[PDB]
Design a binder for these strands. Structure first.
Ligand SMILES: [Zn+2]
Ligand SMILES: [Zn+2]
Ligand SMILES: [Zn+2]
Length: 1241
RNA sequence: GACUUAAUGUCACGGUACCCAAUUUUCUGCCCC
């Protein structure tokens, strides 16, 4: 007669679904599948407010299952009271739910046939001989009656909305044999923190089974998908502002910038509110004069930074992280607007009793530990703007994917993903099993599915609520080796090193060897490193969790069952159990001392361990490494264009993120590098479609219909504390082809890691290889690794100027050694250019020649529409590496413009810039970008290409660009073709095929002493005024003379021998003091070339070594005769793809002499024994400028100077009378500026 | 007490949001009426 009230509390996020009805439930698959979940009925008319509840029938079913288990445990008797076998068969209505399950059954000891006068306690709780059945509720005639389990005070008197209690989520069924999810389904996952308690009542009319009912209530463990214990007692305004910002950006034709702006705002949550409050955003280039290219865009008449500040001051009421997240989400949604399968399972009537053998014992095992992540994990989730549980649309893939976080933003590992990973690991360990089939009427007898019906895990959430970091992926176009437009993706990943609590329970008659094998596989003790692949980006190594601190405790459900009900099996109190002494364990629970080691288990030693084999190596980089973090450089206040990539690493010991970010090369970059290497080696790269392709690259790297067999990891930098300045500031500039000066606002900054040839960066990374590869694929992997070793694919960005050039690879000794089984005289040019001109046979005259002359070569350019691709190594085209020596004939000046006070002489004379010679980690070297433009300009004029870096929009005193011939304008796209010089070194939209390495210093005199005068072995250079494009174009009728080249002379001795005249008299603070090196040094730089044609290699080798008595001009101070480098090729190496896998072979002098001769045939072909280049009219003019008179012809010493204006130095070659039409007409001086070595007297 | 459950039968802890993508190509820190 007594009424029992029951309290139901959940310790996991439970699932709830719409209640609908029973008759109308069949019309909705979501409610039909979720009959074991909590229900939800709407209260209002707008489908926004309702009350959740749990039906009493589900709790009754759980109680019946608990009763069956308890009675079976104690040999069919409870407290000395025997029980019958029950009755679960009906036929003639029928129950609304059918069993379709094995019912635990009993043997004997029933008193008699159960009638409605002596019903056993099992019959009392089962409600067999009651007055009410399946007809209707009618009255409370039930001997046992379960009422609805409504919510509690958490509901409150406010009609709680569904959005406040539940959050929709999508779960998959991942195919084991392939790796791609077959189908998905939706559910609503309520939270257990606030709305996890349900209250109900249980009515008993017969007191014969009170003890059994209470014991069953204690024994109930799972309900509605969550572990439970039963006890007896401003987006709208943000969206509008985001669309206003998008419209303002569109008014400036900058819609593509909206994506990067949204991503930057989203990433801004990592930085504090002081970034916007104190204006800590980058200030942009000062020389640009237009402000930052993004943060200074005028939105409705106001700067973007000020607009963001106003938005923060107006919407700070919702915190900082939420504000930035909402703004980024709204901007991304507006940008996207402007631009599988759902299978909810299914719905015999066979009674299947199961009688366990007599005398057997049943025990429950508890495994507790920590799932410490070893790589940045990622648990995917649909877009929050699309979840909206309750308001889902019916029937444009997203390019931005978030991560799974709970209501407190704590990182979460759902028990769904953990259970799926455990299921697949058990499947691998067992060697058999079935793909999970839904809707079956029978329980499959699989070796895995039997074990997974008794294993229960727990939802785990970290104690870390910091925002996740965003990782970027790009799709390189194979044809042009550039970034494909509209191929940007971003994944939010968590930090590396978080610890998630891990709880596992197994209730069986014996602990299986396969489950223990899986546990030892997951555990990371000594040399195991952990292999619990948890997450959703395994192909790039995101989520290799490692079980730690494993503690196994064993119950005893035969004699110590009463303690199990009394303590509720330690459900929800596992965290305390993990870190408590064994002397305080609850009675009936003992530690498991029979847990075998990893080497003692057979399934682990055979099936689980050799599935994934790691390959680890330390990549040595002997050059700057710039990974070009694209959003961090847009947020950090350093005001730099490109910075190196860095990570955030969690530290368990300090329970916080490491204060120093870890520099590394992205695992995505590693994967792309090896994928490109393998694709180009095997020729499968560049194929039209990979929809159903089964090529080698698709086989060993996965496609849309499969999963990759190789998983990569990050390239962490270990050699990081041996530099004392890890990253060096290197800045470049674009030089006009006509004036010869900088292109005004064209400078860009780079901040890469300071890798040095003698102090190289050491990056240590690894990748896992799945078992089952044949010999061919392992050979392909080893070949790709060897290609990476030989420096074919430079790491990072700016690989064409010598950034991230690999110097070697040292594989790990333990395990990669198995795959380790698969892994003449110097060239001389004898061409002597006559170049006699005026200076020759004029020793006693001592004429004066203008320092710079203009090379005119017409307006005829041949553009090739058959652009050579980078998809594959073409057989007929050459590819290899040039190793050449650079020797200086005049003092060379390469200023280290990073620090304008390298000599620290600004104290005495402020405003006087002081640079040093370029050096990385204290050793002198020449930048590869300075050699690139030094050879490109020579090669562009040699092949009569266009003015690639010409600067238009400058007027006279109809713009220089307008005056230039239309054929010589820079090549914009690939539609019209590319110039001969624009096709080797490449332009935008086409990566160049020639890469120039850094020029280290090897031998020769160290510095220029300059005894006396200058203290710090330097030369105080004269004033270097900006070039004036008015002496060459006096009138509008005159056209652009063409390229500008500087004569070769040793006039720097005037600067050196009169140093006291410059720095003391005249030119107070507009000069420059730089360290210089004396003539006679040697520099070794490698020019890697790829897929060059037959004559393109001859032109290159002719450009590097034009012959005797010809040299190039390099470095600052060219008009003064500074930096006349003499490049000689030491050895040419050329490899080729072949079946025999022949290594790199160095071509002899005969091939080089043949290569150059074939290159000469191209030049004469375009115009229309040993070659004589001085026959072509334009080459003859070019080689006169590069002719050096003082190399061997010692008697020559031309006087090369700029004429003074007046009254400065006239000791008649003065600008006072040189532009006057009376003395020298305009048509004459232009002709005098075009012919090299024309004496101006 | 209804808005919410039928009762001699609820493996939904019966299902990883899983697979595909090099942050990147090009640019000499240059220089005279
Ligand atoms: Zn009975
Ligand atoms: Zn099965
Ligand atoms: Zn061109």
């Amino acid at each position: 007669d007594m009424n029992i009230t029951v309290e139901l509390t959940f310790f996991e996020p439970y699932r709830l679904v719409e209640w609908f009805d029973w008759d109308a439930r069949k019309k909705s698959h979501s409610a039909m599948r979720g009959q074991a979940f909590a229900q939800w009925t709407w209260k209002g008319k707008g489908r926004t407010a309702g009350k959740s509840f749990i039906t009493g029938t589900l709790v009754r079913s759980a109680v019946i299952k608990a009763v069956e288990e308890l009675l079976s445990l104690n040999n069919g008797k409870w407290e000395g009271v025997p029980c019958c076998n029950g009755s679960f068969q009906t036929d003639e209505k029928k129950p609304s739910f059918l069993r379709k399950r094995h019912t635990l059954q009993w043997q004997a000891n029933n008193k008699n046939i159960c009638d409605k006068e002596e019903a056993c306690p099992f019959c009392i709780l089962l409600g067999r001989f009651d007055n009410a059945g399946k007809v209707h509720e009618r009255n409370k005639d039930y001997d046992i009656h379960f009422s609805n389990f409504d919510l509690d005070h958490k509901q409150e008197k406010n009609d709680l909305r569904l959005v406040d209690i539940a959050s929709g989520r999508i779960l998959n069924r991942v195919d084991f044999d392939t790796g791609k999810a077959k189908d998905y389904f939706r559910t609503w996952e309520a939270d257990y923190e606030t709305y996890g308690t349900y209250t109900g009542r249980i009515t008993l009319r017969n007191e014969h089974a009170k003890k059994l009912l209470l014991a069953s209530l204690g024994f109930v463990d799972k309900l509605c998908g969550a572990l439970c214990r039963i006890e007896v007692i401003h987006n709208d305004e943000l969206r509008k502002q985001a669309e206003v910002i998008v419209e303002a950006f569109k008014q400036n034709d900058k819609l593509e910038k909206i994506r990067i702006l949204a991503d930057a705002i989203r990433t801004l949550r990592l930085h504090g509110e002081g970034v916007i409050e104190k204006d800590e955003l980058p200030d942009g280039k000062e020389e640009r004069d237009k402000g930052h290219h993004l943060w200074d865009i005028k939105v409705q008449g106001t700067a973007l930074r000020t607009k963001l500040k106003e938005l923060w001051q107006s919407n700070k009421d919702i915190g900082w992280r939420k504000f930035t997240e909402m703004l980024g989400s709204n901007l991304y949604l507006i940008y996207k607007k402007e631009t599988d399968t759902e299978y909810y399972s299914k719905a015999s009537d066979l009674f299947i009793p199961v009688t366990p053998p007599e005398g057997i014992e049943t025990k429950e095992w508890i495994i507790v530990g920590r799932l410490k992540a070893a790589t940045p994990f990622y648990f995917g989730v649909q877009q929050p703007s699309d979840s909206i549980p309750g308001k889902e649309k019916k029937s444009n893939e997203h390019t931005s994917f978030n991560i799974l976080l709970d209501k407190e933003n704590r990182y979460r590992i759902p028990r769904s993903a953990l259970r799926g990973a455990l299921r697949r690991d058990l499947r691998t360990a067992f060697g058999s099993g079935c793909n999970v089939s839904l809707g079956g009427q029978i329980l499959c007898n699989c070796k895995v599915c039997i074990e997974m019906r008794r294993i229960t895990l727990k939802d785990s959430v970290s104690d870390f609520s910091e925002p996740p970091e965003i990782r970027y992926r790009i799709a390189k176009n194979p044809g042009t080796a550039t970034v494909e437009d509209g191929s940007l993706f971003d994944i939010e990943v968590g930090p590396e090193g978080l610890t998630f609590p891990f709880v596992l329970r197994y209730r069986g008659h014996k602990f299986p060897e396969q489950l223990s094998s899986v546990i030892r596989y997951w555990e990371e003790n000594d040399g195991k490193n952990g292999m619990a692949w948890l997450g959703g980006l395994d192909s790039t190594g995101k989520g290799r969790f490692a079980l730690k601190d494993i503690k196994i405790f064993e119950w005893d459900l035969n004699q110590k069952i009463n303690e199990y009900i009394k303590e509720r099996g330690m459900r929800g109190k596992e965290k305390e159990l993990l870190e408590m002494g064994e002397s305080s364990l609850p009675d009936g629970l003992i530690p498991y001392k029979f847990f075998e080691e990893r080497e003692c288990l057979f399934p682990y030693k055979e099936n689980l361990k050799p599935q994934w084999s790691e390959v680890q190596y330390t990549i040595e980089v002997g050059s700057p490494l710039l990974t070009a973090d694209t959003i961090s450089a847009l947020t950090e206040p350093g005001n730099r264009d490109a910075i190196a990539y860095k990570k955030r690493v969690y530290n368990d010991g300090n329970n916080a993120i490491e204060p120093e970010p870890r520099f590394a090369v992205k695992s995505e970059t590693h994967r792309g590098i090896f994928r490109t290497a393998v694709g180009r080696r095997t020729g499968d790269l560049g194929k039209e479609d990979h929809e159903d392709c089964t090529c080698d690259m698709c086989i060993i790297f996965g496609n849309e219909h499969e999963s990759s067999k190789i998983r990569f990891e990050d390239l962490e930098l270990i050699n990081g504390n041996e530099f004392e300045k890890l990253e060096k500031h290197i800045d470049h500039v674009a030089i006009d082809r006509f004036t010869g000066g900088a292109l005004d606002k064209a400078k860009f900054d780079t901040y890469p890691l300071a890798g040095s040839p003698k102090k190289p960066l050491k990056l240590k990374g690894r990748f896992w290889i799945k078992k089952g590869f044949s010999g061919d694929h392992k050979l392909l992997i080893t070949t790709a690794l060897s290609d990476i070793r030989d420096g074919l694919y430079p790491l990072g960005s700016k690989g064409g100027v010598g950034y991230g050039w690999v110097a070697g690879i040292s594989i790990d000794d333990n395990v990669p050694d198995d795959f380790k089984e698969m892994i003449n005289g110097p060239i001389n040019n004898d061409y002597v250019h006559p170049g006699h001109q005026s200076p020759k046979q004029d020793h006693k005259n001592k004429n004066i020649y203008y320092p710079h002359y203009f090379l005119d070569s017409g307006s005829k350019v041949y553009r090739e529409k058959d652009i050579i691709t980078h998809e594959e190594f073409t057989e007929e085209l050459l590819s290899g590496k040039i190793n050449c020596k650079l020797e200086t004939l005049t003092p060379l000046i390469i200023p280290d413009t990073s620090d304008e006070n390298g000599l620290k002489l600004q104290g005495n004379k402020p405003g006087h810039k002081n640079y040093k010679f370029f050096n990385i980690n204290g050793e002198l070297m020449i930048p590869g970008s300075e050699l690139r433009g030094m050879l490109r300009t020579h090669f562009e004029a040699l092949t009569k290409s266009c003015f690639a870096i010409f600067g238009e929009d400058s007027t006279l005193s109809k713009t220089l660009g307008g005056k230039l011939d239309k054929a010589l304008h820079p090549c914009t796209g690939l539609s019209d073709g590319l110039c001969p010089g624009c096709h080797l070194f490449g332009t935008t939209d086409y990566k160049g095929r020639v890469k120039f390495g850094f020029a280290k210093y090897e031998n020769g005199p160290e510095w220029l002493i300059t005894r006396g005068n200058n203290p710090e072995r330097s030369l105080t250079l004269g004033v270097l005024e900006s070039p004036r494009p008015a002496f060459s174009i006096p009138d509008d009728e005159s056209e652009i003379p063409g390229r500008k080249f500087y004569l070769h002379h040793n006039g720097w001795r005037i600067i050196r021998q009169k140093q006291l005249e410059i720095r003391e008299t005249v030119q107070p603070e507009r000069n420059v003091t730089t360290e210089v090196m004396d003539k006679g040094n040697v520099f070794s730089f490698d020019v890697r070339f790829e897929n060059l044609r037959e004559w393109e290699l001859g032109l290159l080798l002719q450009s590097l070594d034009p012959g005797k008595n010809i040299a190039h001009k390099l470095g600052k101070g060219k008009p003064y005769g500074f930096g006349s480098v003499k490049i000689k090729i030491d050895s040419l190496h050329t490899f080729k793809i072949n079946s025999n896998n022949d290594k790199i072979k160095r071509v002899p002098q005969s091939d080089i002499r043949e290569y150059i001769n074939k290159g000469y045939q191209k030049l004469i072909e375009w115009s229309g024994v040993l070659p004589q280049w001085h026959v072509i009219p334009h080459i003859d003019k070019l080689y006169k400028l590069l002719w050096v008179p003082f190399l061997n012809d010692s008697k020559l010493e031309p006087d090369v100077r700029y004429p003074v204006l007046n009254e400065e130095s006239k000791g008649d070659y003065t600008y006072k009378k040189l532009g006057d039409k009376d003395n020298l007409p305009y048509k004459t001086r232009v002709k005098g500026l075009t012919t090299p070595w024309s004496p101006w007297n």
